[PDB]
């Protein structure tokens, strides 16, 4: 036997880094009682097959790191030093601060006299790094305390994907999964650097290519992804809608779209109202003064019976499809080439290659991430591609779909658990002030009088009611609905989001902040503003693995500890392999992982910290009372606990949900206590509880279906890699979403060789069908009100069709598409200057990742092997720029924006080349954002010193992918 | 015995192999800096047995030929490192007659290290100047003898890294050469009859590294 692994116990885990969800094998000394001795890949895991990228392969060195936090630390106001304290001291004092701060800022009624029952002076950041059970629990705790300012990674990451794909398909999630890439005939990677950022994914990408697939990378840079691709085209940052709109024109103009699919499955036939217009960058209904659209002007013309009108012949001039052709006729290769920098030759080659998947027996997939999301036009970037997939019949089919690649291991799951201001778990909207009662709440949910339109959201009252029974099972849903806090109906949703939280914090309007498993002094755009704003807090509770730029902002660069009155509690948590729980990968795969080592030193799981913290808040409210203490007193935390510790199992079972009384649901008999077998069996009347209705099916009487490790498949399942018996995905194990669009009227696969479902012997076989019902009898997009794939998407803040707008800081002063240079309703903050074609910041700035580092680098800048490979911040520039600025490869340079400045080592490379934009060379400067002032020595500081606090009007995501900088040689040392 | 087939047409230079080698052996990290390249550490050393070299070459039209090369001991069938070392002292370099592993022992401390390194056609051996011991890739012989894959082969996401019997891996190498040759006409196997680590190069091996082939 091997000396290293011999007396060690083997347990399985899932990777604590990216959303690929790679399987890990962990070996713990003294058959489990000592420290991890080894971590490597799980050879039996169906996604990674024992593979690990260098982040996964160095988890051992993360877990067994001596720089790890050992115990709680306290930083007194105006102190320059940490004081080691007890868990009892830290958590008792935090409860006193929570309580003091909540009592002084608790608003029962807003200005207008409406009920809101909310705390305005505390915000919470985090976290996609926590298990699903800790995420759910944390959000319920924060809301029982009446917080509305609840954000995490999702806001500044894939927030655009949710409304973008939900408008388009009804759901906001990744449409297929990782193993399904191997089934594609054309993989377009664009807004994504997947060989670096989702490495194990390239196993499946290259297997696609082995079996005939064309690989295309469109990116400002030549990357490690570009090297392993058949076609590489450059594109300028923030010029993706031109490209995609050019492709829409090309598909339509050459009749390369899938006619039958488009006619029956998309809203191509639906008739748009006479009020809808577009004229020189503005849609109908533009309020120039409020910088807001009147969406009423974009409604469909309705028949008498409430249903939107349809012309199946696609002839009516106000048919969605005829208005589509009209919108994108301006996107001719000459105009797209001038604005993207991408040659006509190259546009023609990519368009020809991708458009050929129009055929029914073909599937093109898109892999996209931050390159599309982190923009003022983020949502419209994604709609534009979502539209292209619908024209080509690529949604619902194997090797197709919209693979919006999730980042953090549980960002999917943390978004599921509603750790965002605008959503409760299960993506139920947080109630606004006009929703005075549970009836007025449910009255917002759109209704359909089309018999074929499933309109599944109509079931919401059951989920909302079951959720409220999950929190408060001894109270009527009507009564419990008054405990949870509300937002103002008057105000834009972005007033409750990340960027505005930091604007408020910087005007002294916040007293308290939970930085829970996040590092916003490096991760938040405009880091200088963020670092100053944290100074204006009374208290800060940082929960994390190591001391960091957030915890210790008070002794960061240009900071005098003695000027800063913030009280900071540093509370050290466990790593992933020290705790049991589930994490939701990009494929919605909810995977269960096991404890290897005992928690290091006096570190504690997040769940145990937040439960103990909450028990001290409740206990304090019992003793001395205060503002509206009901939601705190009555919150069901009994079901979160076993053996005086947080029980991830019990919480998973509650999130699945169970019966509170014996009841009859959907034509079946259920006995009190039984787990809810699926979300179809939840009730509005109060006989079912369920923390999250997407979880309804994950933990049945059968057992924990998330912890299933069964590679068994039917021959048709194995042909497209579904692995239905490996863990569990939402909803109800539908591995490929919208799979009803993968069959004709009669239920026959479009691509029989790669069938997702098929009607065979009065049953669907293959993947669980997404929408029950016999072939031809329903519309395949069951989460849509009208049941159709939306080419026209009238719910989106800047309009129903993507249109090109230059980034808020751009290199040109004129848009060749309209008089509207910028997004007409862009999220901006008053008096924050933007550099627009300014000779002081003449260069396009963008930020991005390398394979070896994770996020702000808080974790991996502590891992000697990852630092060894990528020791310092670098700046990627072209040979032509380096010539112009007298910068040699390896030279120190200063990169500056209007917001900040940093030094980096120049990497001069043909991998970046000038963009020819309107007959003028525009140079780009690229920076990684993985570095910060605390570790290592000479590592550098965050690129987010440079990035602007402005972004997408829908979701408030900042534009960290396109801004403007200068770069200059540094002559020092 | 055993053989690696390394398909550089599928390398993403993720540097998983680089990290996996250090995790298995618990090797210390070098102190590195960026000198204008992703490459780090810049070279093999006493404590780095595998690093991914990065070289930028030109091609027609857009982008570059980005050549990745995870460098490691070739585990020569007739190793010159052993010839040279045996002049001073036998037992310093031994052959595993089952796996084909060429293994350095503590006894390399008592031979002329600069000569062993200079004897290597691929310039692989590195000396601890403190201790005078030599280090390189040991083919994870420990793992191989207990029927496991080397750390770097197990960790590779892409199919770049392959390991097993010499017969299987030459057959795989020739199959993969024919297929890859369509996408890349300059593709070649590196000294396939002399080493146990056969690399598929997508163009002239020298472009990958000075000492890619003998
Ligand atoms: N190695 C590594 N992997 C990670 C992470 C990490 O930090 N490191 N983090 C994880 C997280 S949280 C996430 S969300 C994902 C992010 O995954 P990615 O999106 O891959 O991340 P980035 O590298 O930031 O950006 C992707 C690419 O977009 C390009 N790009 C920039 N601007 C534009 C533009 O305007 N248009 C287009 N078309 N492309 C543009 C950049 O050049 C870059 O190559 O990665 C996840 N995995
Ligand atoms: N310029 C620029 N800015 C960006 C981006 C970009 O591309 N460019 N990307 C954005 C994106 S996608 C994201 S997701 C954000 C990331 O922003 P942050 O989330 O602030 O990033 P980190 O804190 O570096 O990474 C996640 C944190 O999780 C912690 N963690 C790990 N395991 C645990 C655990 O068990 N418990 C707890 N409590 N914490 C744990 C790690 O210690 C780490 O601090 O950055 C965003 N900011
Ligand atoms: S970081 Fe992502 S690709 Fe790498 S091992 Fe982890 S899950 Fe897999
Ligand atoms: S692990 Fe494989 S793909 Fe990654 S750098 Fe090494 S050989 Fe290449
Ligand atoms: S590559 Fe060099 S060190 Fe390795 S076996 Fe061959 S001669 Fe010896
Ligand atoms: S075979 Fe073993 S020692 Fe050799 S490079 Fe791979 S992991 Fe390192
Ligand atoms: S993420
Ligand atoms: W992310």
mmCIF file of C-alpha atoms in Angstrom, chain A residues 586-694:
data_model
loop_
_atom_site.group_PDB
_atom_site.id
_atom_site.type_symbol
_atom_site.label_atom_id
_atom_site.label_comp_id
_atom_site.label_asym_id
_atom_site.label_seq_id
_atom_site.Cartn_x
_atom_site.Cartn_y
_atom_site.Cartn_z
ATOM 1 C CA UNK A 586 -24.128 25.432 -13.099
ATOM 2 C CA UNK A 587 -26.204 22.381 -14.345
ATOM 3 C CA UNK A 588 -28.545 22.793 -11.301
ATOM 4 C CA UNK A 589 -26.989 19.469 -10.051
ATOM 5 C CA UNK A 590 -27.528 19.558 -6.228
ATOM 6 C CA UNK A 591 -24.545 17.483 -4.992
ATOM 7 C CA UNK A 592 -24.030 16.247 -1.397
ATOM 8 C CA UNK A 593 -20.496 16.265 0.123
ATOM 9 C CA UNK A 594 -19.138 14.799 3.403
ATOM 10 C CA UNK A 595 -16.880 15.919 6.319
ATOM 11 C CA UNK A 596 -13.234 14.830 5.996
ATOM 12 C CA UNK A 597 -11.234 16.500 8.826
ATOM 13 C CA UNK A 598 -12.798 18.060 11.966
ATOM 14 C CA UNK A 599 -12.895 21.887 11.751
ATOM 15 C CA UNK A 600 -9.304 23.341 12.040
ATOM 16 C CA UNK A 601 -8.429 25.051 15.389
ATOM 17 C CA UNK A 602 -11.542 26.858 16.849
ATOM 18 C CA UNK A 603 -13.097 27.504 13.340
ATOM 19 C CA UNK A 604 -16.903 26.871 13.032
ATOM 20 C CA UNK A 605 -19.237 26.017 10.102
ATOM 21 C CA UNK A 606 -21.204 29.102 8.803
ATOM 22 C CA UNK A 607 -24.535 27.434 9.815
ATOM 23 C CA UNK A 608 -23.323 26.936 13.449
ATOM 24 C CA UNK A 609 -22.081 30.611 13.559
ATOM 25 C CA UNK A 610 -25.369 32.137 12.209
ATOM 26 C CA UNK A 611 -27.616 29.832 14.366
ATOM 27 C CA UNK A 612 -25.572 30.659 17.558
ATOM 28 C CA UNK A 613 -25.557 34.392 16.564
ATOM 29 C CA UNK A 614 -29.397 34.270 16.062
ATOM 30 C CA UNK A 615 -29.992 32.356 19.375
ATOM 31 C CA UNK A 616 -28.235 35.279 21.192
ATOM 32 C CA UNK A 617 -30.427 37.867 19.311
ATOM 33 C CA UNK A 618 -33.712 35.994 20.176
ATOM 34 C CA UNK A 619 -32.530 35.369 23.822
ATOM 35 C CA UNK A 620 -31.763 39.143 24.174
ATOM 36 C CA UNK A 621 -35.243 40.079 22.727
ATOM 37 C CA UNK A 622 -36.904 37.719 25.292
ATOM 38 C CA UNK A 623 -35.014 39.437 28.199
ATOM 39 C CA UNK A 624 -35.266 43.202 27.427
ATOM 40 C CA UNK A 625 -37.725 43.295 24.402
ATOM 41 C CA UNK A 626 -37.603 46.033 21.682
ATOM 42 C CA UNK A 627 -38.905 46.885 18.152
ATOM 43 C CA UNK A 628 -41.429 44.291 16.688
ATOM 44 C CA UNK A 629 -39.797 41.124 18.205
ATOM 45 C CA UNK A 630 -42.373 38.613 16.749
ATOM 46 C CA UNK A 631 -40.504 37.425 13.587
ATOM 47 C CA UNK A 632 -37.385 36.758 15.760
ATOM 48 C CA UNK A 633 -39.341 34.945 18.569
ATOM 49 C CA UNK A 634 -41.543 32.783 16.254
ATOM 50 C CA UNK A 635 -38.962 31.752 13.546
ATOM 51 C CA UNK A 636 -38.789 27.901 13.349
ATOM 52 C CA UNK A 637 -35.055 27.204 14.213
ATOM 53 C CA UNK A 638 -35.951 23.949 16.097
ATOM 54 C CA UNK A 639 -36.027 22.084 12.707
ATOM 55 C CA UNK A 640 -32.484 23.453 11.839
ATOM 56 C CA UNK A 641 -30.868 21.617 14.808
ATOM 57 C CA UNK A 642 -29.770 18.134 16.004
ATOM 58 C CA UNK A 643 -27.241 17.343 18.845
ATOM 59 C CA UNK A 644 -26.942 21.134 19.695
ATOM 60 C CA UNK A 645 -25.280 21.826 16.260
ATOM 61 C CA UNK A 646 -26.741 22.992 12.869
ATOM 62 C CA UNK A 647 -28.092 19.875 10.983
ATOM 63 C CA UNK A 648 -27.646 20.360 7.196
ATOM 64 C CA UNK A 649 -29.712 17.105 6.735
ATOM 65 C CA UNK A 650 -32.788 18.406 8.705
ATOM 66 C CA UNK A 651 -32.606 21.786 6.848
ATOM 67 C CA UNK A 652 -32.372 19.990 3.433
ATOM 68 C CA UNK A 653 -35.522 17.994 4.451
ATOM 69 C CA UNK A 654 -37.316 21.287 5.411
ATOM 70 C CA UNK A 655 -36.212 22.924 2.097
ATOM 71 C CA UNK A 656 -37.653 19.860 0.270
ATOM 72 C CA UNK A 657 -40.704 20.318 2.559
ATOM 73 C CA UNK A 658 -43.123 17.914 4.333
ATOM 74 C CA UNK A 659 -46.839 17.616 5.321
ATOM 75 C CA UNK A 660 -47.986 19.470 8.508
ATOM 76 C CA UNK A 661 -51.272 17.415 8.487
ATOM 77 C CA UNK A 662 -52.644 14.322 6.644
ATOM 78 C CA UNK A 663 -54.015 15.729 3.284
ATOM 79 C CA UNK A 664 -55.238 14.796 -0.251
ATOM 80 C CA UNK A 665 -53.233 16.548 -3.048
ATOM 81 C CA UNK A 666 -53.337 16.086 -6.879
ATOM 82 C CA UNK A 667 -55.331 12.800 -6.571
ATOM 83 C CA UNK A 668 -53.231 11.035 -3.860
ATOM 84 C CA UNK A 669 -53.338 10.490 -0.033
ATOM 85 C CA UNK A 670 -50.498 11.997 2.141
ATOM 86 C CA UNK A 671 -49.997 11.394 5.922
ATOM 87 C CA UNK A 672 -48.607 14.166 8.277
ATOM 88 C CA UNK A 673 -44.744 14.106 8.459
ATOM 89 C CA UNK A 674 -44.125 12.484 5.007
ATOM 90 C CA UNK A 675 -41.657 14.487 2.806
ATOM 91 C CA UNK A 676 -43.270 16.322 -0.199
ATOM 92 C CA UNK A 677 -42.412 14.066 -3.204
ATOM 93 C CA UNK A 678 -42.511 17.034 -5.714
ATOM 94 C CA UNK A 679 -43.703 20.697 -6.051
ATOM 95 C CA UNK A 680 -46.943 19.534 -7.807
ATOM 96 C CA UNK A 681 -48.003 18.201 -4.295
ATOM 97 C CA UNK A 682 -47.601 21.547 -2.379
ATOM 98 C CA UNK A 683 -50.775 23.377 -1.115
ATOM 99 C CA UNK A 684 -51.708 27.057 -0.408
ATOM 100 C CA UNK A 685 -54.085 26.082 2.476
ATOM 101 C CA UNK A 686 -51.219 25.490 5.025
ATOM 102 C CA UNK A 687 -51.067 21.620 5.049
ATOM 103 C CA UNK A 688 -47.566 21.655 3.326
ATOM 104 C CA UNK A 689 -44.321 23.462 4.356
ATOM 105 C CA UNK A 690 -41.348 23.897 1.900
ATOM 106 C CA UNK A 691 -38.420 26.361 2.360
ATOM 107 C CA UNK A 692 -37.800 26.312 -1.448
ATOM 108 C CA UNK A 693 -40.246 24.775 -4.000
ATOM 109 C CA UNK A 694 -37.374 24.033 -6.494
#
